[PDB]
A paper describes a structure:
The PH domain-containing protein [name] from [name] is a component of the target of rapamycin complex 2 (TORC2) signaling pathway. We have previously reported that in vitro, the [name]-PH domain ([name]-PH) interacts with liposomes containing PtdIns(4,5)P2 and DHS-1P cooperatively. The core of each monomer consists of seven antiparallel β-strands with a C-terminal amphipathic α-helix connected via a long and flexible loop.
Electron densities corresponding to the Ins(4)P molecules were visible between the β1-β2 and β5-β6 loop regions (difference density maps). For the two structures determined in complex with Ins(4)P, the positions of the inositol ring overlap. In both cases, the oxygen atoms of the inositol ring contact the β1-β2 region through the hydroxyl group of Tyr485 (hydrogen bond length  = 2.8 Å) and the NH2 group of Arg478 (hydrogen bond length  = 2.5 Å), and the β5-β6 loop through the ε-amino group of Lys542 (hydrogen bond length  = 2.7 Å). In addition, we observed a contact with the ε-amino group of Lys562 (hydrogen bond length  = 3.2 Å) from the β6-β7 strand. Interestingly, the two structures differ with respect to the orientation of the phosphate at position 4 (P4), which contacts either the β1-β2 loop or turns 180° and contacts the β5-β6 loop. Also in [name]-PH, the most conserved positively charged residue within the β1-β2 loop (Arg478) is flipped towards the non-canonical binding site to interact with the Ins(4)P molecule. The non-canonical binding site is shallow, large and solvent-exposed, and so the phosphate position of Ins(4)P in one of the structures was seen on the opposite side of the molecule. * Crystals of the same protein-ligand complex were obtained in different crystallization conditions.
Author numbering:
A (entry chain B), D (entry chain A): 465 to 529, 539 to 581
B (entry chain D): 466 to 528, 539 to 581
C (entry chain C): 467 to 530, 539 to 581
């Protein structure tokens, strides 16, 4: 089961409506940030959602001392309404910055 | 910064309805994605994404002579063991889809 | 081919005070130079400049050549640490496309 | 120092002329298989060579039970002469197959 993954791992996404974080298993490719319900990379291969990097940017992130959050901004209507913003939370500042920087270089 | 192998329109047959429906498909190293349209800037959410690691391509038309079969090895979008039939515009176009899919799903 | 931008740029030599032209391909990781734009037959970069080791500092203001920008080396690679290479595009508008992408990539 | 890495790790490349293996640190992106002298991802960033995937294929590999080798074939003149073949050796069959399958899906 090869896969052109640039980064993978669990992230929590804040829901503005549910007022809580939903954890998923995320996989970054050159085209999409995909969410899967689980990390079973051999069997769980229908994405919950696929966010097109061509129309997303990463804007802000936590300053080191949770300090492990970043914002993904939508430039066009898709999974996210144009102009709207999703907040992600990683395990640590360092992990967050790995996600942030990898996303940044694919969304310039 | 895209990474796509092939893109274009395909018709997918319904086994039960015995009819074809058309979509815009994008083949990447990981998925066969279907979109409603070819507008990569405004049509951003795949109708479905078929994981290649769970599929094989089995047969195709000989020189419509533009069909090929995608077989599901595991449950996903397609039930395990089932088969979806796609139709391109020409034999030559179909063979481009097939030859890439064959390598990707080996 | 996963690329952000491609096109011809002229690179100035500090000491020779002249420009030389190449075909550049900007990816998330590198600014690559090739001799030509033939991506099927010209396969080996003349040089590959790692973006994580660079920053872009200044660029020309619009004339209203206004098409230059500066790439600064933060570490020793193709360019010695602390040194600067100057590139020239065909227009201010083209230059700003290069600069704006580079600014984001090298932040 | 973010980087669009699909896979990275040490490989040994056989030299037909030196009659020996040369070890390098390899990084696979969607565009190239790069070799670096070392794994210092923060400082060693001039590739020793960059092999364009658009004109390479992977042809054969070892059968399990060294059984950790694969062949990279050149379709065009570049680092390798058109029609010529380079042999790589990984640490294990499993590692080799990870390299082989990741290369295969980027070179169809
Ligand atoms: O959206 P909810 O209600 O889940 O709020 C939380 C946050 O979004 C965090 O920044 C934060 O670190 C918190 O733990 C806080 O609970
Ligand atoms: O071409 P050289 O001389 O480098 O020979 C080697 C091999 O090609 C390997 O299969 C093998 O596992 C060996 O290590 C052997 O040295
Ligand atoms: O430039 P060097 O030789 O240091 O190569 C490294 C990389 O540039 C990384 O993407 C990567 O994740 C590596 O760790 C790899 O060592």
């Amino acid at each position: 089961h090869p896969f052109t993954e640039i980064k993978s791992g669990f992230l929590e996404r804040r829901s503005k409506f549910l007022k809580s974080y939903s954890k998923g298993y995320y996989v970054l490719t050159p085209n999409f940030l995909h969410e899967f319900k689980t990390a079973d990379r051999k069997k769980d291969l229908v994405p919950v959602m696929s966010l097109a990097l061509s129309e997303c940017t990463v804007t802000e992130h936590s300053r080191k001392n949770s300090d492990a959050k970043f914002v993904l901004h939508a430039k066009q209507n898709g999974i996210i309404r144009r102009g709207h913003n999703w907040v992600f939370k990683a395990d640590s500042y360092e992990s967050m910055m790995s996600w942030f920087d990898n996303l940044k270089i694919l969304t310039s």
